[PDB]
Amino acid sequence: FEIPDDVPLPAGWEMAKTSSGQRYFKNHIDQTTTWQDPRKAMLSQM
Amino acid sequence: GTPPPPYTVG
């Protein structure tokens, strides 16, 4: 779990739990739910 | 492994 609370959520990037707690970040700017995070697990791994 | 939810919006 590398998604600390350093930041809440980016624009059009909410998040909700599934049948259990699969925190998936919802995307309103693009309309889509994703497992990764739009503010920590995006196109960046340096 | 599993696909994301069906998404929603109020």
CA distance A40 to chain B (A): 18
CA distance A38 to chain B (A): 14
**Cβ–Cβ pairs < 8 A, chains A and B:** 19
The single-letter DSSP state of residue A27 is: E
By DSSP bridging, strand A25-27 and strand A32-34 are antiparallel
Query: What is the CATH number that goes with domain A1-46?
Result: 2.20.70.10
Per DSSP, the three-state class of A33 is: strand
Q: Are A24 and A13 in contact (CB under 8 A)?
A: no
Nearest by CB to residue B5, choosing from A24, A28, A31, is A24
Q: Whole-angstrom Cα distance, residue B3 to residue A2?
A: 21
- In chain B, residues with a C-beta closer than 8 Å to the C-beta of A22 are 2
Query: Determination method here?
Result: NMR
E runs forming strands in chain A: 25-27, 32-34
Domain assignments of chain A as residue spans, ordered by start = 1-46
Residue type, A1: F
The single-letter DSSP state of residue A24 is: B
